[PDB]
Amino acid sequence: KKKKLILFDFDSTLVNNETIDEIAREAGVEEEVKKITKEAMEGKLNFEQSLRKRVSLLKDLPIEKVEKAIKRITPTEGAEETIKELKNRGYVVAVVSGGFDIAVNKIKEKLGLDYAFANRLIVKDGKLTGDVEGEVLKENAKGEILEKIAKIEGINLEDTVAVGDGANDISMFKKAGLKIAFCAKPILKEKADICIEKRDLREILKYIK
Ligand SMILES: [Mg+2]
C-alpha cells in the first residue's frame, strides 16, 4: 500500500570490499590507505579530509589499474536474494556511498538498484589526477540524500530503513525510520536500533516490513 525505501551503504555492506583500499593496492599504497580508511570509519577523522588525503595518494594511477581493482569488487553474501525480497515487499532500493561512481554504478546496474549516489574520482588523460569531488562528503551528506530520495518518491521518513557500517552512515541513521548496523564499527552501533553481526545480508529481512 504505502511505499517504502531502504538505503544501503556500499563499501563493506552491499559489497565485501573497500573500494579505495583496492585501488590503493594497484597504486602500491594499500597498507597506508587501509589505515586511514579504518580510522575514518571508526569516526576518528573528518570524512572529507580523510577521503581527499587517500585520493591524493592515488595521483597518476592509470585508469586501467583502477578498473583492475574495481573488477575485484563482489556483492556481500545474500545481496541478490535480499534485494529481490525487498523489491517484493514493496521497497525502493538505494545505495549511498562516500566511494566512487565508477565502482558504485557497476553494482547499481548489476543489482538493479533504483538509486545510486557516490563521489567522483577526477581523471585526465586516462590517469587519476589525485582529486575527488562530490556530494557525499560532508558529515550530513548521506542523511540529506535519504531525505531527497524519500521526497522524490513521496515516502514518509518513518517508512525508510538504513543499513550501514561506518561513521559516515551516522547522518543516514539520523533521518531513517529503522537503523540497522551491519557488522559495523562501534560509533555506528551505538546509534543503531538493530545490530547484526552475522555477515549475510539476508539477516536483515526478518526485521523488515
Ligand atoms: Mg561502509
Residue 2 to residues 89, 91, 111, 155, 175: CA-CA distances in angstroms? 11, 10, 23, 8, 18
How many other CB atoms sit within 10 Å of the CB of residue 94?
22
Ligand 1 center from residue 102 Cα (angstroms): 16
Among candidate residues 51, 75, 99, the one where a domain is terminated: 75
Q: Is 65 found in the same domain as 124?
A: no
The verdict on whether residue 142 carries a ligand-binding annotation is yes
Same domain, 26 and 111: no
The β-bridge relationship of strands 115-124 and 127-133 is: antiparallel
| Collapsed DSSP state (helix, strand, coil) of residue 126 | coil
Residue 165 assigned ligand-binding role: yes
- Give the domain extent around 66: 15-75
User: Which run of H or E residues covers position 141?
Assistant: helix 141-153
Is residue 71 located within the same domain as residue 109? no
Helix (H, G, I), strand (E, B) or coil at 2: coil
Give the chain's domain count.
2
Give resolution, Å, one decimal: 1.5
Give residues with Cβ within 8 angstroms of 18, minimum separation 6: 11, 12, 34, 37
Does one domain contain both 134 and 178? yes
Assess whether 121 and 153 both reside in one domain: yes
Regarding whether 106 and 24 lie in a shared domain, the answer is no
CATH number, domain containing residue 67: 1.10.150.210
Q: Which of 75, 108, 126 is the last residue of a domain?
A: 75
**Residue 159 annotated as binding site:** no
**Are 168 and 107 in a shared domain?**
yes
List, as one string, the DSSP characters of 37-101: HHHHHTTSS-HHHHHHHHHHTTTT-BHHHHHHHHTT--BPTTHHHHHHHHHHTTEEEEEEEEEEH
Residues 109 and 142 grouped into a single domain: yes
- Whether the Cβ atoms of residue 93 and residue 113 lie closer than 8 Å to each other: yes
CATH no. for residue 195? 3.40.50.1000
- Ligand 1 center from residue 155 Cα (angstroms): 25
Question: How far is residue 98 from each of residues 55, 103, 167, measured CA to CA in Å?
Answer: 12, 11, 11
Same domain assignment for residues 42 and 65? yes
Tell me, in angstroms, the distance from the centre of ligand 1 to residue 160's CA. Answer: 19
19/171 Cα distance (integer angstroms): 21
Positions marked active-site: 9, 11
- Provide the grid cell at 181: 548496523
Name residue 208's amino acid.
I
The residue numbers preceding gaps of C to N over 2.5 A in the chain are none
Residues 96 and 149 in one domain: yes
If asked whether residues 136 and 82 sit together in one domain, one would say yes
In the sheet with 91-100, reading across from the earlier edge strand, the strands are 127-133, 115-124, 91-100, 4-9, 160-164, 178-182, 194-196
7 HSE (CA, 13 A, CB side): 34
